[PDB]
């Protein structure tokens, strides 16, 4: 009997992640859900090419919350657009609950896996995904028969599935007992990276725009006053050092103050001088 | 005519050119500022006028070529200083 | 979820409510009900998740007014 | 810095007063205000050191 | 019978301003597309119908859709304040026919021209060739102006029906009685 | 109308996905869709978009297809998903505007009166051109010129809200970023600014070449804005600006003496401590 | 395929190469690892332009990651012990966008310069190991130092 | 359970008090009939 | 329907230009920020928010 | 990478944070905080915090989702 490998990965597309995050935040504090489009490239790869949201329903996030008519028209009409991808799986946002499946979630996932054996049930936490960490996990299931007979839910052939550790929260809510966490990998090609880099690419202008000279002088005065006080603290600490065998330092704070003054002042001088040269009447 | 090399124009220039008395250069400058064509200022002490004006004109294709050459000069100055800073900072640019 | 409407504030009316989960809540828009009678104390059924007034329900009792039949 | 960052993402542990170590594996502990639970003790902590009315972290 | 996506080319030009049919040539086109789309939809329930304007631009107000009520309502308030252009209209019809939803649907459009087309025979014949390469089978019906079935139109027919090809019938409508029976006797039996 | 148009780093990815999914076989090189978003009589932000089936033919650039009931249906579906975004404008790749842009804008002005073209540049991402957003205006060409439409440029920004910008960061987190500005990164920024200035210079020079020889018509407002900009250049002469030596040397006070001498003293202090520490380590060892 | 490659290791026979290329072109993940490894083994140290071109092209064309790993190790083994002859491929795989191909480049650096102690190869490996953005490529680059420096093991812990 | 909200089979909701937790207006399950529910009695209610 | 309701509380202190100590009614206290377009000069201590 | 890690540590000090009372210190890096939400937690002290100002019943701000003494 074939068993899904522990090296199986869910290649979440970049825009798939973006849409999931935006829709999850929009639904806060309610729970949202949507369908995940892509293709099962092989037994060790699930490529979530795209995702489309689903209308918020009074049921919540269940298998009655998937509108068959809405699902249909969206599927045929996206196929017309140029996205003829089979529905890979579904997603729903647990706002602040962490990533796991509640009993209704496993019920809906069973409904989904009735359609196809390979079908994931990724979830995302829209509020715990603060700047930096993104709290998203992908679980498929554990069939009861495989577990009760004692066989491990997934065969192992590599360390890929053991690189990351399952969390206590998910573990208590049935992880590794009713469903397994599938490692999530983000397909991000160079083009999308370069385009995303424009979000904080400032301009060709601020590289030549001088900071306000009055504000520059006030910042410099404040920093040199702080350097005063830090230097007095340094002198007192060093005077103590002599009456001290090996047994906040004014020195470090002084050092990063020096570094900030360095960068700000040198940049201002150099920028002003380039502005003198290139921005010339001639 | 004078490409800001010597902006300060003595009242003799405006008097002979505009065929006016030096008593009236100030008046016509004030009128031109009031209507909204020029935004300069007058120095009566040294008999000079400072001009920083924002009124353009049609530009006489030969003048298009001349301004093209001026643009070329300033752009090659920009390029030269860009190579200079790049070469001097190649250690830091990485 | 039933909530005791503490008071109505003008902004065009916004209400602060004390839901039965000992929690106060400000509502920029007064749910899906009219907003004229809305006595400051009128018990309403506020939404369990989004906390807006879906409907008004008749007042329960006022201590002695039920202590007196 | 990275290890501190990792350890800062883990949830804080509730404190609780152990009523009594029921068994060499279970401990009756009261945690304010969720109530009284009978927790188990992990690999590191040895049961015999858990004395009644001492503060523990769950 | 056959699955198709109809792309009707309605003219609201100013050369449409003709009294060849009794009330109004434009209204003649309106009730003519009404009756022909009624016949086509009733012939095959799953067929698709659409609308194109040819006046001073190709407005595509209704594209290849099965519902007839909304295209019907688009016929009203058509505001005939333009100038006809047959070539770009048929080009837009062809590209819409390429962008149909169901692949099994055999391409089909209904074209009603009641204005003298101002063009050159060479572009017309090359366009007939281009539509022939894509196996797009049109029907064309001459309304309006007295130059009914002009040599341009006959060339279009005999080239699109290359050696009795697709079946762009040269059905002739008199500059007088463009009657509904005169507009249903030929097409509902054949094309 | 709108003094700024904000494009979230989601519609950008939507356009890239549409362009890829088409250009798998769709060598049209330009694809047109509808972009939604919260609509303000102030700065406009684009929060979402979808792709409509668009066809264009290279013949005369006047025969094209845009399934508008598809537009309405997808907008209804988005309303069901999120009624907050309303149809705002549209997008297409192929940075060179075609002839059907204005006609498509007129087509789409019915669903929203203030429709704005938002072009997305996909392949060319060299220096400073992530997008360009345009809006049609109702003026013939100028005070005394014949009729045209002349899409108007609007300043565009790439801005994200919370829970979308975090997805961008997680998609990022290569050797890139480093939001704090180190001296190295700031000098690199200055170099990039010089490069961008030079590129814009070459662009304007190229247009002036095209006009001077008569290949391109003289456009009067263009020439006027030229004369203004070369009038606006400053003068490093006029020795009152040159008295910026004052502030240059004032800066040299805080950079040259204070922080540099403090750094030198700190480094020496770190040195001597090691020299004692090494000496003490040696003594502990004869 | 694993058995064929390992038995015919380095023989550079053409019939086995063609059969295994057919199996690789059958485009399946489970057999793709074996196909790529077997191409690496059969044409081991051969420097053949045909095999390397076909394998790199397939690695740039396919979608299955297992095939990617197999082709990576295969590209590594095809250029075994070729020393500076492999610099073109090494650069071409270092500049590849796919991290798996960068790992293949690191493995090729290891195999081509196995035991040479080439300072340029060590420099490239260390730069990649401290600079690359993919963890697997860093790991491969830093492990390749073992193959590079095995002939001088006493200098090896120092680095 | 508290006041029947004057149900009349079109307002089957009742305000119910789950001890120190909040109070909720809730509709019946299909397995129970309104004749079996009146004010003031203890009733078992689901979580969902 | 698109609205979500809001907590209420009293501002306790102005830690800095942006960070405010705010105590929710019959609940915990937090340090919170303020909306971008708001009259910070109006947010005195004790102001119900 | 050090600059990036410092940025992450600084960002973990963002808002909103729940107020709590620093009950007692346990280790050099962990402490027991009584959160104003009415519960007591055994949480982790941020390294950058000056230990000397960490006095009993000193009001401390805790991370919203981890209660770490931020
Ligand atoms: Zn769930």
From Swiss-Prot, chain A:
Q: Does the keyword Hydrolase apply?
A: yes
**SS bond partners:** none
Q: Name one Pfam family in it.
A: JAB
A molecular function (GO) term: metal-dependent deubiquitinase activity
Motif JAMM motif extends across 92-105
Q: Name one GO biological process term.
A: double-strand break repair via homologous recombination
The question of whether Repressor is a record keyword is answered with no
Positions where Phosphothreonine occurs in the chain = 245
Where, by tissue, is this protein expressed? Widely expressed. Highest levels in heart and skeletal muscle.
Q: What does this protein do?
A: Component of the 26S proteasome, a multiprotein complex involved in the ATP-dependent degradation of ubiquitinated proteins. This complex plays a key role in the maintenance of protein homeostasis by removing misfolded or damaged proteins, which could impair cellular functions, and by removing proteins whose functions are no longer required. Therefore, the proteasome participates in numerous cellular processes, including cell cycle progression, apoptosis, or DNA damage repair.
Subunit details: Component of the 19S proteasome regulatory particle complex. The 26S proteasome consists of a 20S core particle (CP) and two 19S regulatory subunits (RP). The regulatory particle is made of a lid composed of 9 subunits including PSMD4, a base containing 6 ATPases and few additional components. Within the complex, PSMD4 interacts with subunit PSMD7 through their respective MPN domain. Interacts with TXNL1.
Q: What is this protein called?
A: 26S proteasome non-ATPase regulatory subunit 14
Which organism is this protein's natural source? Homo sapiens
Q: Which gene encodes it?
A: PSMD14
Swiss-Prot record, chain C:
Q: How is it modified after translation?
A: Sumoylated by UBE2I in response to MEKK1-mediated stimuli.
Q: Which domain of life is it from?
A: Eukaryota
Q: Where in the cell is it found?
A: Cytoplasm; Nucleus
Instruction: Identify its protein family.
Output: Belongs to the AAA ATPase family.
Q: Which disease is it linked to?
A: Deafness, cataract, impaired intellectual development, and polyneuropathy: An autosomal recessive disease characterized by early onset of deafness, cataract, severe developmental delay, and severely impaired intellectual development. Patients later develop polyneuropathy of the lower extremities, associated with depigmentation of the hair in that area.
Reported function: Component of the 26S proteasome, a multiprotein complex involved in the ATP-dependent degradation of ubiquitinated proteins. This complex plays a key role in the maintenance of protein homeostasis by removing misfolded or damaged proteins, which could impair cellular functions, and by removing proteins whose functions are no longer required. Therefore, the proteasome participates in numerous cellular processes, including cell cycle progression, apoptosis, or DNA damage repair.
What this protein is called in its record is: 26S proteasome regulatory subunit 6A
| Annotated gene | PSMC3
- Segment of the intact protein contained: 89 to 176 of 439
Swiss-Prot record, chain F:
**Keyword Acetylation among UniProt keywords:** yes
Q: Which GO molecular function annotation, any one, does this entry have? A: protein homodimerization activity
- Enumerate the spans annotated as MPN domain: 5-140
Q: What keywords would UniProt list here?
A: Acetylation, Isopeptide bond, Proteasome, Ubl conjugation
The record, for InterPro entries, names: EIF3F/CSN6-like_C, JAMM/MPN+_dom, MPN, MPN_RPN7_8
Q: Where is this cross-link: Glycyl lysine isopeptide (Lys-Gly) (interchain with G-Cter in ubiquitin)?
A: 176
Its GO CC terms?
A: cytosol; extracellular exosome; extracellular region; ficolin-1-rich granule lumen; membrane; nucleoplasm; nucleus; proteasome complex
Which PROSITE patterns does the entry link to? MPN
Further comment:
Does not bind a metal ion.
Q: What does this protein do?
A: Component of the 26S proteasome, a multiprotein complex involved in the ATP-dependent degradation of ubiquitinated proteins. This complex plays a key role in the maintenance of protein homeostasis by removing misfolded or damaged proteins, which could impair cellular functions, and by removing proteins whose functions are no longer required. Therefore, the proteasome participates in numerous cellular processes, including cell cycle progression, apoptosis, or DNA damage repair.
Q: Which family does it belong to?
A: Belongs to the peptidase M67A family.
Record's subunit section: Component of the 19S proteasome regulatory particle complex. The 26S proteasome consists of a 20S core particle (CP) and two 19S regulatory subunits (RP). The regulatory particle is made of a lid composed of 9 subunits including PSMD7, a base containing 6 ATPases and few additional components. Within the complex, PSMD7 interacts with subunit PSMD4 through their respective MPN domain. Interacts with TRIM5.
Source gene?
PSMD7
From Swiss-Prot, chain I:
Family under the similarity heading: Belongs to the AAA ATPase family.
On assembly, the entry states: Component of the 19S proteasome regulatory particle complex. The 26S proteasome consists of a 20S core particle (CP) and two 19S regulatory subunits (RP). The regulatory particle is made of a lid composed of 9 subunits, a base containing 6 ATPases including PSMC6 and few additional components. Interacts with PAAF1.
Superkingdom assignment = Eukaryota
**Protein name stated in the entry:** 26S proteasome regulatory subunit 10B
**Where in or outside the cell is it found?**
Cytoplasm; Nucleus
Purpose = Component of the 26S proteasome, a multiprotein complex involved in the ATP-dependent degradation of ubiquitinated proteins. This complex plays a key role in the maintenance of protein homeostasis by removing misfolded or damaged proteins, which could impair cellular functions, and by removing proteins whose functions are no longer required. Therefore, the proteasome participates in numerous cellular processes, including cell cycle progression, apoptosis, or DNA damage repair.
**Which residues are recorded as modified (N6-acetyllysine)?**
23
